[PDB]
Symmetry: C3
Subunit: 311 residues, 3 copies
């Protein structure tokens, strides 16, 4: 008879501890719908690489300007100035040629830089490359600037505004001294102002390296909230992680004397992805009663098996 008492004990212990108190089996879970607003702050100066000092404001190093959940902060770039649409020699990458016979008119099949012509022109004092129609002069992105141009982006600040809501429960929570306040994993774990160097350091990456050629940093805001407790306990955890380099080409188009030109930029930047996930639970009677009924059922399959086995 003691064995049956022990069986009833293990099941009660399982049902109360594991099902209810440990895993919150008495609760009903809901996700959230969230909105994120990011505001960058800081100035950058590129003294030597800019041929005289050059200043980069928020209107310049943040893509997009209006902001988004995923945004890029430029940390380095190569600029091809005054590119016009006309005839020019292509990068030796397109292929080095030493006669007009090699050149084949028409667009190339791989790494096309324009429309080739049956002509060979000098790329510089040594290499002769196939003439093309396209944006000229052609870009040279081989030499990535090192050290990075916007290496002061590590001291920029990132202010994140997050407004979530658990629609099933009608609970709405925002994530906001704090003006002159900076986030530290432990010392200041609830201050929504982040420094980019610190964010990159917490993702496990080196800002010097992830600057000189770009990268991706994913920021996660975790709202794990037990709505049985007061909503004042519903607080966010900021989790930093890295999701080769990140680069993109953008072009500033301008007109001079009736002709359309453009400044081509190859932007090596850090793409920030603010991911917001959360689980809110609150007591419900249906899961509670379901767990107790299934538990009485396990008592039966256990007691009967023990008795039948004993018999």
């Amino acid at each position: 008879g003691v064995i049956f008492r022990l069986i009833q004990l293990v099941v009660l212990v399982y049902v109360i501890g594991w099902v209810f108190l440990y895993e919150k089996g008495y609760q009903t879970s809901s996700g959230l719908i969230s909105s994120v607003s990011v505001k960058l702050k800081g100035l950058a100066v590129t003294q030597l690489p800019g041929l005289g000092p050059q200043v980069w404001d928020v209107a310049d190093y943040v893509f997009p300007a209006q902001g988004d959940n995923s945004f890029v902060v430029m940390t380095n770039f190569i600029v091809t100035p005054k590119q016009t649409q006309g005839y020019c020699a292509e990068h030796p990458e397109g292929g080095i040629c030493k006669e007009d016979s090699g050149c084949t008119p028409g667009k190339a099949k791989r790494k096309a830089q324009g429309i080739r012509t049956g002509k060979c022109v000098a790329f510089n004092d040594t290499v002769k490359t196939c003439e093309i129609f396209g944006w000229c002069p052609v870009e040279v992105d081989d030499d990535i600037p090192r050290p990075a141009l916007l290496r002061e982006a590590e001291n920029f600040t990132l202010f994140i505004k997050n407004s979530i809501s658990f629609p099933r429960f009608k609970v709405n929570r925002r994530n906001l001294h704090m003006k002159t306040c900076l986030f530290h994993k432990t010392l200041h774990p609830l201050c929504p102002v982040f420094q980019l160097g610190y964010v990159v350091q917490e993702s496990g990456q080196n800002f010097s390296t992830l600057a000189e050629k770009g990268g991706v940093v994913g920021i996660t805001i975790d709202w794990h909230c037990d709505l049985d407790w007061h909503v004042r306990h519903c607080r966010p955890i900021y989790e930093f992680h890295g999701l080769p380099g990140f680069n993109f080409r953008f072009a500033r188009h301008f007109v001079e004397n009736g002709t359309n030109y453009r400044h081509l930029f190859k932007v090596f930047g850090i793409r920030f992805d603010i991911l917001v996930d959360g689980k809110a639970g609150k007591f419900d009677i249906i899961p509670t009663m379901t767990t107790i009924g299934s538990g009485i059922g396990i008592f039966g399959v256990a007691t009967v098996l023990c008795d039948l086995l004993l018999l």
Copy 2:
């Protein structure tokens, strides 16, 4: 014996009414994957503030132009024209100085506007401020235009196209007289063309105030759909809510006589976030059978307790 009959009654009532008929405990829930397309319509004119009439088209007051789930409609702005990169006095905010001793060469630690120099120059006929290298002339954003410049944005129309799908069930639903049709919470509750003034009014905010200095308006499309009923009943509910002001700085870069300038804009706008959440349920046999088994289990723990207590 009557007590046992009553206990069997309460449980049947609970299981049938609350578990099944009220909370749809016989069903299996699925979320959705959605796509939103927004198309703005309207023109704005800024007669007096623009130094002669000025017209703002969709290509201008919507950020981004291509559209997105979250977009900004400019309602007011401050423009700093022909900013070049050169030497100039900084905003008195950087700090008022009355000699060259105060000026400290190098970028400042807080609110840096450029690269200071050991020189003091006149900001105007009274204040003398530290000379800086940066975009000049410097911006003055203290005087926010009131009334708003694009106060006609309240009469712009917002056409939202939403295409959802409940992938688990393979059900795809779109949210579309209606051309000349406008949405009213009650009179016209299914017309996807919204007027910005009405959307802001339904979020609880005043458009005059949320125009002069910006704001955030969140639009939610709720697809709560019972797939036991015909898909023609699967319809969206449009829920408007507000998620200080919203502002961003963008720059139009142009070239004049070989020199790079820019028009700096401080945009006070209303950011619209189209959030689309939904729950689709359809009958499943597993939850139904689970609910009945747990219910037979509760009958046991109830009948036994009553009998044992009576004994």
Copy 3:
């Protein structure tokens, strides 16, 4: 007695096969949080329509340049060159007028193109239209170019980088010869480089038609992963589907001799939406024990009913 044995059989078969082995009722499900990076590749040339050859690079035909989950690839456009803000005749759409009496000063109520004036001016050698203040000359978008200008966009390549994570289980999965590798539904079903023509073909749409006037193509990455098996089996399925045309107006602003102009573009493009959904299950003891208890419960309601009915 045989009937009771058969009843115990049907329930065991149901519980083991349908509840556990078929529907994975012994498991616990988790969604995912994902990040998508898209990189376009290709060049386009518009020989005849461009009044001499015209070249379109990635910096030009992709909106936004930095990339996003939802992006637009321009396939056709109408350009209104050198639009200045001044006085001009409006499109005959605004309304044809044959005197000054018809013209009514002030902005129109529908399809407003500017600020009308009590004057009538000639649109061309035949129609006389109401004079307006606005961006002039006015746009004429009636004639959509056919064949499309960027009809070579079908041979552009779309490289998608997807990094998901199932946060509940702490499992992180990315979706990556493959450099010169192209995706085919069956032959190459795991190569993340897609060709736009093929993507559009797999959505059921014709690229010639969805080019000449735009469209929407939705790309879904499905991560259905059984974490009982090794993570090497957790792989993505690429599902292509179409979510009238898609068009947007963007403006390149430039300055000439102190005057602000703009190039107005009406972009007919294909909007790509990368939707990433997934379900990860892993064995849990709570659902397993819940299913067995409810099953013992069904045995009871079945055996008792059979006996009572027999009696």
